[PDB]
Write a protein that binds this DNA or RNA. Sequence first.
RNA 1: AUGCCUGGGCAGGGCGAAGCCAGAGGAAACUCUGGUGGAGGUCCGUAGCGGUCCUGACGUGCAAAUCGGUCGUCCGACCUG
RNA 2: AAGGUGAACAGCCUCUGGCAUGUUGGAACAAUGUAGGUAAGGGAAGUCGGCAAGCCGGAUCCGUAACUUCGGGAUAAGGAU
RNA 3: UAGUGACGCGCAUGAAUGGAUGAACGAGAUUCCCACUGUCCCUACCUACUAUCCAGCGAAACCACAGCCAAGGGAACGGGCU
RNA 4: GUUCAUAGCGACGUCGCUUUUUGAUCCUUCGAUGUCGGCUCUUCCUAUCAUUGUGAAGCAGAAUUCACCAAGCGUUGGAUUGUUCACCCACUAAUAGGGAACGUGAGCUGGGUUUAGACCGUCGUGAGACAGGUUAGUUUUACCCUACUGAUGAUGUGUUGUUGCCAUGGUAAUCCUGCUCAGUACGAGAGGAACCGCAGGUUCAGACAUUUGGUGUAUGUGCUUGGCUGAGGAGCCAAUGGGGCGAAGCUACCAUCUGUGGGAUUAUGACUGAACGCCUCUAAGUCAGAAUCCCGCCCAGGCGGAACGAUACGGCAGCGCCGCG
RNA 5: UCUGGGUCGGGGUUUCGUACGUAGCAGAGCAGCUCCCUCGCUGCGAUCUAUUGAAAGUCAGCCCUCGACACAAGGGUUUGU
Lengths: 63, 394, 131
Amino acid sequence: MKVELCSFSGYKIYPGHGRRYARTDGKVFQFLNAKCESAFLSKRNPRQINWTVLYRRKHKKGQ
Amino acid sequence: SHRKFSAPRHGSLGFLPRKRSSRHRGKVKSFPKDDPSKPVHLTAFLGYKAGMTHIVREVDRPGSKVNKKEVVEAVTIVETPPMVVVGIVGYVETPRGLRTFKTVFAEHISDECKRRFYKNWHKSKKKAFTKYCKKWQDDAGKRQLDKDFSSMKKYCQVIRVLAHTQMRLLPLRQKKAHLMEIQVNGGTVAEKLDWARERLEQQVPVSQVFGQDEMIDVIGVTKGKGYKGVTSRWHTKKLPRKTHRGLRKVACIGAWHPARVAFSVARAGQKGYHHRTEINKKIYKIGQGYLIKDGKLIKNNASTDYDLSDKSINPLGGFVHYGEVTNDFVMLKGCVVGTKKRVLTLRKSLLVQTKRRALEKIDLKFIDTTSKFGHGRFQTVEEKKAFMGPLKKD
Amino acid sequence: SGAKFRISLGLPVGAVINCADNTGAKNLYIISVKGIKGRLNRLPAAGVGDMVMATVKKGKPELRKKVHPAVVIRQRKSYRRKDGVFLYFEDNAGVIVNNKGEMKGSAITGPVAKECADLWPRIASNAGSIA
RNA sequence: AUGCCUGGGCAGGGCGAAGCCAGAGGAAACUCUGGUGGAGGUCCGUAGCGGUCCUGACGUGCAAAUCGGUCGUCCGACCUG
RNA sequence: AAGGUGAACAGCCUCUGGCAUGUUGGAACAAUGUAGGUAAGGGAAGUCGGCAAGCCGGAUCCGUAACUUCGGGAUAAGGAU
RNA sequence: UAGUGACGCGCAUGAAUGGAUGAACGAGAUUCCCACUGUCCCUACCUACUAUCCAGCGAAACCACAGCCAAGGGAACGGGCU
RNA sequence: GUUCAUAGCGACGUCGCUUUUUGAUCCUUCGAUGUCGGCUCUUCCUAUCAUUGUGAAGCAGAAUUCACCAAGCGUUGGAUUGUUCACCCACUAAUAGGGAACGUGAGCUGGGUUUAGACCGUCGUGAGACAGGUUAGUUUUACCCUACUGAUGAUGUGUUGUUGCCAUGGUAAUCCUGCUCAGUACGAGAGGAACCGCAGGUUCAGACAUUUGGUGUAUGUGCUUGGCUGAGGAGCCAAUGGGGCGAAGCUACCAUCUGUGGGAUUAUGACUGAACGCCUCUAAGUCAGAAUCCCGCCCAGGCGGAACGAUACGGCAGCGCCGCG
RNA sequence: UCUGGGUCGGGGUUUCGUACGUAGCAGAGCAGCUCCCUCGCUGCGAUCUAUUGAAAGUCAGCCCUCGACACAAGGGUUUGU
């Protein structure tokens, strides 16, 4: 079972859950849920949204 | 005149007494025909629907486009604690039908089974089977019981066993156990009666009655939906918006010359709570309940040879609107009739199951355990803790 | 040998998909779908990799005002794979084809769904990206 | 329904006609540019007047012709005691 | 004929003043309805007919065709904030 | 079989019983296109007020007698007759 | 029809069936039976378009028309027209024909017949007429009885509870594509099958929400316009203020799962076998035989049964078996 | 009386997205004071940073509680072989 990473949030996507979006330019994205899907489609930058793993890496939260 | 454009009718004419089922527990309308060559075995069991989840496995059907590829299937969990045998009953075939001949109950009967005989348990004095148990503690009673068993052996053609579920081991609120007659199929009538008598006042697990990779039937009451219109009950075409006296209604009921409404006309009424018998449900996994040797053993429920984790079939926070499954369970392919907490009857298949898809062996690779109380994203609380790290509530 | 493994279809009769080949056509108005028995008041629906009949509503006058066979490559409606992933391609795109399955063009712009690629080998051969 | 007499009433905005001022060009005739001006049985639109469509609601109704939305007009052949 | 927003006597909120929701109340939220909404993909393929609903909508800055009675069309169409 | 442009052979067009044209306008009648949407594919869900039940108050139309069907005849399609 | 009447047709004549067309009569209705279409929906008929089983050829295969048992299951989406009718486009096994007061208006629409306002052409001096065209033109009432869908219930079983039986009714699955057979049988060639198997799909039926989508007033959590608590904080009003995300619950071939086996035989093909010393499926007798019929699977369960448990300790009681009055 | 259920609270899960307050040498800048010092001090100031994946809701039709509270043979109508 190939577990994918969410293209917006970064959470692991199990085979049962998630959604796949193949853009016309020729690249594929995986979305954990409709929240992340809508956030990505609204062109929101994941590094400015607090709960995103990219935001946590950027702000050095935890560890 | 005739109908211009032909179209198939709405609904099934063979399924339309559209009334709330008089019974709540599924009735086995037909048991498998007993062949007097196989050993004795119970042909049915009584479980309770808990919830549904995912399953991931590799299929082994040659020639298919998805052969030797990972697939996901929806699986329904039915918690099936072992049932206590409390009585036996004989049936004699008559030209009028199948008449019950003699019913013999056990000496000791649990309060869970006793609750069924009383509509009100708090008000009653719990006097059921008070003088009947005296037959098992007297010489005259023992002789009478032996004579009854001999008469059943001589005359009865069909022998069924009265077994009741163990409501104590369930998270359900109710304590009134469900009793059920299960027809025993096996050898001669004498050997069958001897086996049934030996199994008296004994537990019966699901491994005895059913095995892995078996096609069975699920009998139960549909989740009720109350009074419904024709558009929902029979899925008829909706009238256009311009209609004056409603649009979610059947427009033409019948013709003029027959001055009566036919039974085949789709009418508004009760929808749901219908007795149903789904067939060809595949047992993906018969999982063992919680057992203790030194500590709790919860891995046996959801851990597989490819996952080797410490997860149980219970998702995070338990099953929604059911509880936590701690007893033996059966995992069936696809959905089954009835809502949560609903009692279901599992019956052995009535047909010779010789098919490419019905003989396929199932080897699971991954069992989903994400919380169903929303969009769950973590399989286990340990993984969630590892991913999140420390929180403020620490 | 491999089966179709039906998926969600969201291109009924009347859908205008975009042409994804260098034939010269811009739009393809779907007029009907092959291999559909039909039902009363039920519009035929076309999914990924389904053979359809279309008309060039915009493009070369040679291709306009005539019926062309075509194969649907991408659909914006999300369809479920056999392994449990839902996929949609952000647009409805198709390519003009003949009766025997040979493409009338020479190249395909954008990705091509794996269902269509497996069902039509020539479209897979001309495909740049799969799924 | 119409004629007459005597009274009352009709937010806020768009188009910017005659007339006038300044600048530039011309040999003249005069012509272009920027302003001022607020005329119109002028346009959007409220009060008012009327009743297109939903053939909507109701249709032993609130009502022996009413209600909702959407509507035409709203400085003049206007409305009204 | 008050204050705020607002071009406004538009709509909405508030002060002086007025009232108990308009010939009754309680308990559940079944089917039909009346009045509002939302819907993945297609976008009139439904229907006699785009009926209904929906789309655009204020202001500022650009731009504005055919025709013409040269007055208009015109807030034409189409763009940015 | 609709809409628009040309032909006249016009059952039975035609010049103040006015012909042709026509900028602006029209809650006038039609055709096509763009965008838009549950009109539809194919229905689903939510809210308010009824419909539901209860307390109180409480009518009206209609009414030969009353109301289960198949066939027959009949005054030529019966709830009554066989 | 290359030869040949009956493979398929069939002139000159002739015998019938149907009221799904128009006709004739006026028998019922003028103290009113709502007058075309379309939408929705149920059932029925075969004069069978396709699917099941077969007979036929001018049937070598494919294709094909002819005939038989046969109505179980299907008979589509659109441009035009109010249309029935009609033609075309595309798919498909096929887009077969009809009835039920020319089914169906207290079911819907009102598009055009068919009130009143108007325009055009013909006719009439005129008012006016036009199966000659165009436009706008109110579709009332169920709470009554029965029928139907559901829901309490009802007489008996001494009373209740239990697990069950069953008479009766309803009935359900249907069709197609791809691989192998096989470029094989067949055929000079072109072309081109069929049985059993494997993968699946169209329509329909029964469910269910793990996933995807929808709804969303948990008015759950943020963001915001106008106003109001002096302001910060916390809030409210603007018929759900608007707009993102959204738990649970309902829901979509818009997600997912499942859909079964026997008996008698029809058409037909046959065995033995006389009538008729021969021959014959038939006269006696016998075999194979299907989307047919019936039953099984499945829904309900009879003014119908089943055995089993307890059967009124009371502060007054009330009962069950035995025997003889 | 498998002691049961109810209320509250605690966790698990889940939805949203980082609460009020505090501090900052962050912050387009602006003003006062004066030690005219303009990183000097004091103030206004969309927003940002740490506290803070924080704050808030979470069964009414989600799961464990055995942590605190009270309550739990009680009320009325019945039927005989």
